[PDB]
């Protein structure tokens, strides 16, 4: 509760200062800002005609002389629309490809637990918090990241009675004196028991097997 409550306040201090994290949504607006200012600047272009104003063609010329010059100005304004609408079909295909990526992360990451790596956020996934955004969505990914590291002494199996003891769920570690059973994500040293170990095979076919005594809890319970 000390680590999680400070981590949400670092998001609020970052979004109040740095404006370039939301700049992927600002490129949605700025590509549409150049697209609506595209067709305004095409009206001032002469398109090979003398003047671009349609009142300065038909009222200044003969009707055989106008219909050559008017049909150059319409076809130049048809090609400005054929550059515009074809660009709006290509750029919305990148939005709808990202909309299926956003609807997958609303389904998989938010509604339940997902085991995926670098999809629901970097590290082991816990939960996701959706937040609303203009022309988009803002995800908050709560992840599980380990920090400190410590080196231990391992072995694949433990030889006791002549049968190899394989670990069921866990790893075998040692501090240099006694062999312990811990887990991959965390350090919790335990007493070696028969319920935590699995017995298969002999000790000859295992490369790197060490000798220790597997503690049986039933052996103090015989006389008690």
């Amino acid at each position: 509760a000390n680590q999680f409550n400070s981590a949400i306040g670092k998001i609020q201090d970052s979004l109040s200062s740095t404006a370039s994290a939301l700049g992927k949504l600002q490129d949605v607006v700025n590509h549409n800002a150049q697209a609506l200012n595209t067709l305004v600047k095409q009206l001032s272009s002469k398109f090979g005609a003398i003047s671009s104003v349609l009142n300065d063609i038909f009222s200044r010329l003969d009707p055989p002389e106008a219909e050559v010059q008017i049909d150059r100005l319409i076809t130049g304004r048809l090609q400005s629309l054929q550059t515009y609408v074809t660009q709006q079909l290509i750029r919305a295909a990148e939005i709808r490809a990202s909309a299926n990526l956003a609807a997958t992360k609303m389904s998989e990451c938010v509604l339940g637990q997902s085991k995926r790596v670098d999809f629901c956020g970097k590290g082991y996934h816990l939960m996701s918090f959706p937040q609303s955004a203009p022309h988009g969505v803002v995800f908050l990914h709560v992840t599980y990241v380990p920090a400190q590291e410590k080196n231990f002494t391992t072995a694949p199996a433990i030889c006791h009675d002549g049968k190899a003891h394989f670990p069921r769920e866990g790893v075998f570690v040692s501090n240099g004196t006694h062999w312990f059973v811990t887990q991959r994500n965390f350090y919790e040293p335990q007493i070696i028991t028969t319920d935590n170990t699995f017995v298969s095979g002999n000790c000859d076919v295992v490369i790197g097997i060490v000798n220790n005594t597997v503690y049986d809890p039933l052996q103090p319970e015989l006389d008690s």
């Binding site: 680590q3 999680f4 981590a7 949400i8 670092k10 998001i11 970052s14 994290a21 939301l22 992927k24 949504l25 949605v28 939005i95 990202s98 909309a99 990526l101 956003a102 992360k105 956020g121 970097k122 590290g123 816990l126 955004a133 022309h135 988009g136 969505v137 803002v138 995800f139 908050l140 990914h141 709560v142 992840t143 599980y144 990241v145 380990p146 920090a147 400190q148 590291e149 410590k150 080196n151 231990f152 002494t153 391992t154 072995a155 790893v171 570690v173 811990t182 887990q183 991959r184 994500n185 965390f186 350090y187 790197g208």
Partner: protein, 77 residues
């Protein structure tokens, strides 16, 4: 005052031997940055820090600590 790249000739930059995270790319590994009496320097890009992990048969590393971090991804809709 002049440097030859694989993309072409670059005039107005100073070639340095330091390699870190740059800002303005040029190309073919050459990248430009403006840092500090101030000028624009061009150099070869860094891949990050050097880390060589140990390897033996008998040594395992179990983490004793964990830190919950919050990351932010923004997808347009």
């Amino acid at each position: 005052n002049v440097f030859q790249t694989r993309a072409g000739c670059l005039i107005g930059a100073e070639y340095v031997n330091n390699s870190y995270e740059c800002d303005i790319p040029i190309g073919a590994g050459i990248c430009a940055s403006y840092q500090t009496s101030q000028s624009i320097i061009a150099y070869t890009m860094s891949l990050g820090a050097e880390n060589s992990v140990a390897y033996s048969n008998n040594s395992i590393a179990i983490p004793t600590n964990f830190t919950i971090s919050v990351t932010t991804e923004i997808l347009p809709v």
